[PDB]
Design a protein around this motif. Structure first.
Motif, PDB file in Angstrom:
ATOM      1  N   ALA A 201       5.744   8.961  13.674  1.00 28.24           N
ATOM      2  CA  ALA A 201       4.488   9.252  12.684  1.00 28.24           C
ATOM      3  C   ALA A 201       4.278   8.307  11.890  1.00 28.24           C
ATOM      4  CB  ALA A 201       4.800  10.562  12.180  1.00 28.24           C
ATOM      5  N   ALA A 202       5.114   7.617  11.309  1.00 28.22           N
ATOM      6  CA  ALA A 202       5.184   6.401  10.533  1.00 28.22           C
ATOM      7  C   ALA A 202       4.245   5.149  11.328  1.00 28.22           C
ATOM      8  CB  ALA A 202       6.111   5.918   9.824  1.00 28.22           C
ATOM      9  N   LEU A 203       4.626   4.796  12.335  1.00 24.60           N
ATOM     10  CA  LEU A 203       4.090   3.935  13.076  1.00 24.60           C
ATOM     11  C   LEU A 203       2.598   4.107  13.432  1.00 24.60           C
ATOM     12  CD1 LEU A 203       6.746   3.080  15.893  1.00 24.60           C
ATOM     13  CD2 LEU A 203       6.160   1.680  14.145  1.00 24.60           C
ATOM     14  N   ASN A 204       2.544   5.514  13.817  1.00 25.23           N
ATOM     15  CA  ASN A 204       1.029   5.964  14.041  1.00 25.23           C
ATOM     16  C   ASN A 204       0.084   5.769  12.902  1.00 25.23           C
ATOM     17  OD1 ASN A 204      -1.284   7.453  15.689  1.00 25.23           O
ATOM     18  ND2 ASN A 204      -0.882   8.747  13.842  1.00 25.23           N
ATOM     19  N   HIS A 205       0.600   6.145  11.693  1.00 28.77           N
ATOM     20  CA  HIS A 205       0.013   5.961  10.453  1.00 28.77           C
ATOM     21  C   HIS A 205      -0.404   4.768  10.119  1.00 28.77           C
ATOM     22  CE1 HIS A 205      -0.878   7.205   6.486  1.00 28.77           C
ATOM     23  NE2 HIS A 205      -0.554   6.074   5.976  1.00 28.77           N
ATOM     24  N   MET A 206       0.589   3.559  10.256  1.00 24.96           N
ATOM     25  CA  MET A 206       0.085   2.296   9.930  1.00 24.96           C
ATOM     26  C   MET A 206      -1.124   2.090  10.951  1.00 24.96           C
ATOM     27  SD  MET A 206       3.422   0.195   9.298  1.00 24.96           S
ATOM     28  CE  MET A 206       4.334   0.556  10.807  1.00 24.96           C
ATOM     29  N   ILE A 207      -0.852   2.336  12.081  1.00 28.07           N
ATOM     30  CA  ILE A 207      -2.173   1.967  13.329  1.00 28.07           C
ATOM     31  C   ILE A 207      -3.348   2.608  12.873  1.00 28.07           C
ATOM     32  CG2 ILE A 207      -2.467   1.810  15.631  1.00 28.07           C
ATOM     33  CD1 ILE A 207       0.640   1.750  15.737  1.00 28.07           C
TER      34      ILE A 207
ATOM     35  N   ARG B 100      -4.296   5.332  10.261  1.00 35.29           N
ATOM     36  CA  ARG B 100      -4.482   6.140   9.223  1.00 35.29           C
ATOM     37  C   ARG B 100      -4.517   5.302   7.865  1.00 35.29           C
ATOM     38  NH1 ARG B 100      -5.870  10.966  10.624  1.00 35.29           N
ATOM     39  NH2 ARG B 100      -5.798  11.551   8.362  1.00 35.29           N
ATOM     40  N   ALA B 101      -3.791   4.367   7.920  1.00 34.66           N
ATOM     41  CA  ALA B 101      -3.808   3.527   6.794  1.00 34.66           C
ATOM     42  C   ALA B 101      -5.401   2.858   6.593  1.00 34.66           C
ATOM     43  CB  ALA B 101      -2.819   2.166   6.664  1.00 34.66           C
TER      44      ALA B 101
ATOM     45  N   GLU C  15       0.847  -1.273   0.031  1.00 33.30           N
ATOM     46  CA  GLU C  15       0.120  -0.107  -0.024  1.00 33.30           C
ATOM     47  C   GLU C  15       0.727   1.256  -0.030  1.00 33.30           C
ATOM     48  OE1 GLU C  15      -3.557   0.000   2.095  1.00 33.30           O
ATOM     49  OE2 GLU C  15      -2.924   1.975   3.459  1.00 33.30           O
ATOM     50  N   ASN C  16       0.615   2.119  -1.173  1.00 39.53           N
ATOM     51  CA  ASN C  16       1.541   3.413  -0.926  1.00 39.53           C
ATOM     52  C   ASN C  16       0.768   4.208   0.061  1.00 39.53           C
ATOM     53  OD1 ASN C  16       3.290   5.126  -2.557  1.00 39.53           O
ATOM     54  ND2 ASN C  16       1.247   6.260  -2.713  1.00 39.53           N
ATOM     55  N   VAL C  17       1.803   4.982   0.544  1.00 44.68           N
ATOM     56  CA  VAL C  17       1.412   5.983   1.364  1.00 44.68           C
ATOM     57  C   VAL C  17       2.087   7.421   0.493  1.00 44.68           C
ATOM     58  CG1 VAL C  17       1.520   7.121   3.595  1.00 44.68           C
ATOM     59  CG2 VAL C  17       1.645   4.834   3.481  1.00 44.68           C
ATOM     60  N   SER C  18       1.172   8.387   0.039  1.00 47.20           N
ATOM     61  CA  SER C  18       1.434   9.420  -0.689  1.00 47.20           C
ATOM     62  C   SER C  18       2.011  10.574   0.417  1.00 47.20           C
ATOM     63  CB  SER C  18       0.326   9.954  -1.371  1.00 47.20           C
ATOM     64  OG  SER C  18      -0.537  10.621  -0.457  1.00 47.20           O
ATOM     65  N   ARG C  19       3.066  11.314   0.158  1.00 42.33           N
ATOM     66  CA  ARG C  19       3.257  12.448   0.749  1.00 42.33           C
ATOM     67  C   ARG C  19       2.124  13.379   1.277  1.00 42.33           C
ATOM     68  NH1 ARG C  19       8.048  15.485   1.880  1.00 42.33           N
ATOM     69  NH2 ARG C  19       9.418  13.999   0.971  1.00 42.33           N
ATOM     70  N   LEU C  20       1.086  13.414   0.762  1.00 44.57           N
ATOM     71  CA  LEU C  20      -0.291  13.977   1.042  1.00 44.57           C
ATOM     72  C   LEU C  20      -0.943  13.285   2.460  1.00 44.57           C
ATOM     73  CD1 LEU C  20      -2.555  15.960   0.864  1.00 44.57           C
ATOM     74  CD2 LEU C  20      -3.763  14.351  -0.897  1.00 44.57           C
ATOM     75  N   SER C  21      -0.762  11.955   2.272  1.00 47.49           N
ATOM     76  CA  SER C  21      -1.491  11.346   3.115  1.00 47.49           C
ATOM     77  C   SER C  21      -0.523  11.137   4.530  1.00 47.49           C
ATOM     78  CB  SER C  21      -1.666   9.819   2.586  1.00 47.49           C
ATOM     79  OG  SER C  21      -2.137   9.061   3.475  1.00 47.49           O
ATOM     80  N   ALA C  22       0.575  11.264   4.421  1.00 46.83           N
ATOM     81  CA  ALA C  22       1.348  11.143   5.528  1.00 46.83           C
ATOM     82  C   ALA C  22       1.355  12.518   6.326  1.00 46.83           C
ATOM     83  CB  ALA C  22       2.905  10.798   5.287  1.00 46.83           C
ATOM     84  N   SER C  23       1.186  12.341   7.453  1.00 46.31           N
ATOM     85  CA  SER C  23       1.401  13.504   8.635  1.00 46.31           C
ATOM     86  C   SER C  23       2.801  13.165   9.280  1.00 46.31           C
ATOM     87  CB  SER C  23       0.209  13.612   9.410  1.00 46.31           C
ATOM     88  OG  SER C  23       0.352  14.607  10.181  1.00 46.31           O
TER      89      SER C  23
ATOM     90  N   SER D 232      -8.175  -0.025   6.214  1.00 50.14           N
ATOM     91  CA  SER D 232      -8.486  -1.049   6.929  1.00 50.14           C
ATOM     92  C   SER D 232      -7.808  -2.523   6.719  1.00 50.14           C
ATOM     93  CB  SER D 232      -9.947  -1.349   7.049  1.00 50.14           C
ATOM     94  OG  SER D 232     -10.559  -0.288   7.367  1.00 50.14           O
ATOM     95  N   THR D 233      -7.246  -2.579   5.625  1.00 47.28           N
ATOM     96  CA  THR D 233      -6.499  -3.901   5.105  1.00 47.28           C
ATOM     97  C   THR D 233      -5.148  -3.770   6.092  1.00 47.28           C
ATOM     98  OG1 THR D 233      -7.461  -3.800   2.969  1.00 47.28           O
ATOM     99  CG2 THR D 233      -5.596  -4.963   3.263  1.00 47.28           C
ATOM    100  N   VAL D 234      -4.706  -2.602   5.946  1.00 42.59           N
ATOM    101  CA  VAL D 234      -3.319  -2.740   6.948  1.00 42.59           C
ATOM    102  C   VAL D 234      -3.501  -2.534   8.002  1.00 42.59           C
ATOM    103  CG1 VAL D 234      -1.638  -0.927   7.191  1.00 42.59           C
ATOM    104  CG2 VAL D 234      -1.904  -1.500   5.148  1.00 42.59           C
ATOM    105  N   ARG D 235      -4.696  -1.732   8.610  1.00 39.48           N
ATOM    106  CA  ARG D 235      -4.744  -1.506  10.152  1.00 39.48           C
ATOM    107  C   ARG D 235      -5.161  -2.950  11.035  1.00 39.48           C
ATOM    108  NH1 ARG D 235      -8.662   3.361  11.169  1.00 39.48           N
ATOM    109  NH2 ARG D 235      -8.030   2.929  13.276  1.00 39.48           N
ATOM    110  N   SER D 236      -6.010  -3.701  10.235  1.00 36.99           N
ATOM    111  CA  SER D 236      -6.535  -4.815  10.889  1.00 36.99           C
ATOM    112  C   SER D 236      -5.615  -5.959  10.740  1.00 36.99           C
ATOM    113  CB  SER D 236      -7.757  -5.497   9.986  1.00 36.99           C
ATOM    114  OG  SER D 236      -7.291  -5.614   8.669  1.00 36.99           O
ATOM    115  N   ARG D 237      -4.555  -5.875  10.238  1.00 35.71           N
ATOM    116  CA  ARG D 237      -3.499  -6.600  10.308  1.00 35.71           C
ATOM    117  C   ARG D 237      -2.248  -6.333  11.075  1.00 35.71           C
ATOM    118  NH1 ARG D 237      -5.587  -7.637   5.651  1.00 35.71           N
ATOM    119  NH2 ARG D 237      -5.404  -9.580   4.637  1.00 35.71           N
ATOM    120  N   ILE D 238      -2.478  -5.411  12.171  1.00 34.37           N
ATOM    121  CA  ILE D 238      -1.538  -4.932  12.950  1.00 34.37           C
ATOM    122  C   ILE D 238      -1.896  -5.025  14.465  1.00 34.37           C
ATOM    123  CG2 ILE D 238      -0.325  -3.028  13.993  1.00 34.37           C
ATOM    124  CD1 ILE D 238      -0.213  -1.802  11.097  1.00 34.37           C
TER     125      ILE D 238
END
Length: 261
Positions: free
Chosen positions: A102-108, A110-111, A27-35, A113-119
């Motif tokens: 911030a990247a850990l928080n993003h996965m948990i 903001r990504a 799953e790509n995380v664009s710069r826009l999406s990333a906080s 549901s496919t990603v978030r549910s696997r964590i």
């Protein structure tokens, strides 16, 4: 039983192979999406389950491309892994720490549901190359809840990591002229507490950029460390303890084995 065990029983061959036994999607995380970081790519197992999550930072001047191989390889052993771009390629280590966070928080949170549910958000780790490795140490010092830290040919102006209690594997490179092991990796390893789970693995015939080049030793020991500590998976202790303490591959290996089995 350990509820966090994933994958088949390991062997040296299985850990040295280019790919582990999990099919992986991205799953790509664009710069826009990333906080709070520059975007990246999340690699995750196709097979639904909960897994530990890992954030990996590149080094000074580096982009996610320089660490992509590691993201894919680690994910293929049963982890959700984000390889980040930083806000700018010239960000310093303590900034990279915040970006890993911030990247850990993003996965948990903001990504998709496919990603978030696997964590399993209670089982997290950080890794990084060079200044990204310095960032991993800093975040580990700030976040004793992290399950593992893996600084790869790490660089940081602070040498004193006596505050770190997270299981930490430092990988150094004997021929590193950019973050020499004598003035970076080894001082860091030695200032980590004697009381924690830790190890120092020095690569033989390796430059500072070894972590950016697919490497069976980095792959094997990174996965074994993440398995042991992120998954509590004692099937992997065997690779870490006594460990490779291997000319052409490993110059030295130090540890606080066996890590309270």
């Amino acid at each position: 039983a350990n509820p966090y065990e994933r994958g088949p029983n390991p062997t040296d061959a299985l850990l040295e192979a280019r790919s582990g036994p999990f099919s992986v999607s991205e799953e790509n995380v664009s710069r826009l999406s990333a906080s709070g970081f520059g975007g990246g790519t999340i690699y995750y197992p196709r097979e639904n389950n909960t897994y530990g999550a890992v954030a990996i930072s590149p080094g000074y001047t580096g982009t996610e491309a320089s660490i992509a191989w590691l993201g894919e390889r680690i994910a293929s052993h049963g982890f959700v892994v984000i390889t980040i771009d930083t806000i700018t390629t010239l960000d310093q280590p303590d900034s990279r720490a915040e970006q890993l966070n911030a990247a850990l928080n993003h996965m948990i949170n903001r990504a998709s549901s496919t990603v978030r549910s696997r964590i399993d958000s209670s089982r997290l780790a950080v890794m990084g190359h060079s200044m990204g490795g310095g960032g991993s140490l800093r975040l580990a010092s700030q976040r004793p809840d992290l399950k593992a830290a893996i600084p790869l040919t790490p660089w940081h102006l602070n040498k004193n990591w006596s505050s770190v209690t997270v299981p930490t594997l430092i990988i150094g490179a004997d021929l590193d002229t950019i973050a020499p092991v004598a003035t970076h990796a080894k001082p860091f390893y030695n200032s980590l507490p004697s009381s924690i789970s830790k190890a120092y693995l020095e690569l033989d015939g390796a430059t500072h950029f070894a972590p950016n080049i697919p490497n069976k030793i980095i792959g094997k020991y990174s996965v074994a460390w993440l398995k042991r500590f992120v998954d509590n998976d004692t099937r992997y202790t065997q690779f870490l303890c006594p460990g490779p303490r291997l000319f052409g591959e490993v110059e030295e290996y130090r540890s606080t084995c066996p890590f309270y089995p």
